[PDB]
Amino acid sequence: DSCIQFTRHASDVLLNLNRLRSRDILTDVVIVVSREQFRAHKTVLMACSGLFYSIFTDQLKCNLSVINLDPEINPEGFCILLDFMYTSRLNLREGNIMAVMATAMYLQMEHVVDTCRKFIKASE
Amino acid sequence: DSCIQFTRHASDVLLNLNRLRSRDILTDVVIVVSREQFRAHKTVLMACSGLFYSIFTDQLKCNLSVINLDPEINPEGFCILLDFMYTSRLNLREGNIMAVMATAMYLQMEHVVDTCRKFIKASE
C-alpha cells in the first residue's frame, strides 16, 4: 500500500498496556505461581507466549479467570518475564538466569530462551 | 536498572494483537459507526485513543460490549484509524484525509491529528 507509519506507535501502545497493568485496569486473569499471584491481560500474555496463546485459544480455558502454572515454576522468574512482556526489558542477572531460561522455555518465549542460552555460553 | 531490551518486542506484540483481531480471538467490544460494526480489544483501543481510554475507565461503560459512536463519524475514517491502532500504518489519502482527521480529533489520537494537519498544510 501507500501507508505512512508512526515509528513510536508500537512502543507507545505497550507503554500504555503496562500503565493499565500497573493500575489493574481491565486485567482479566490471575496467573498463580507457587502461591504468588500475578494479574494480567490475556491478550498481552498470548501475544508474548506460545503457552498462553495455546491456553487462551482453548474453547474451555479461554473462559478461566485463574491459571495455575506448573509447581516447578519460580515466581521471580515469572515476574521478570511478565515485566519483559509489558516493557521489552529483561532483568537478566547471574543469580536469576537459570530460573528465567527455565520459565521462558515453559512459557515458549523463544527470543528470551535465545538470549539466556547465549549469556550462559559466554560464562562457560 | 541493568536490563537488556529486545528491539522488535513491541512491534511483535502489536503484530500478534492484530492477528488475534483478524481471527476475532478474545475481542470484547463492538464499535458501532453509522450502522457499520467493528470488533476490537478494549485494551488496544484504550492504549491508542484518549476517547476510548475515558470510556473504558468509566465504572459503568467499562462493562458495555457495544459502544455507539457519534453519527457524524464516518465508518471509513474509523476503519483506517482502527487499522492504524493495530499496525502503526496509516492509509492517508487525498480522498480520506478530512474524514481521517475529524475521526482522529474525536477519538483523541494526537499524533494522527498532527500528521493530518501537516499533510493538509502542504497542499494549501
Binding site: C3, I4, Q5, T7 | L90
Partner: peptide
C-alpha cells in the same frame, strides 16, 4: 512518521 516515515515511509515504511
Amino acid at each position: 512518521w516515515v515511509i515504511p
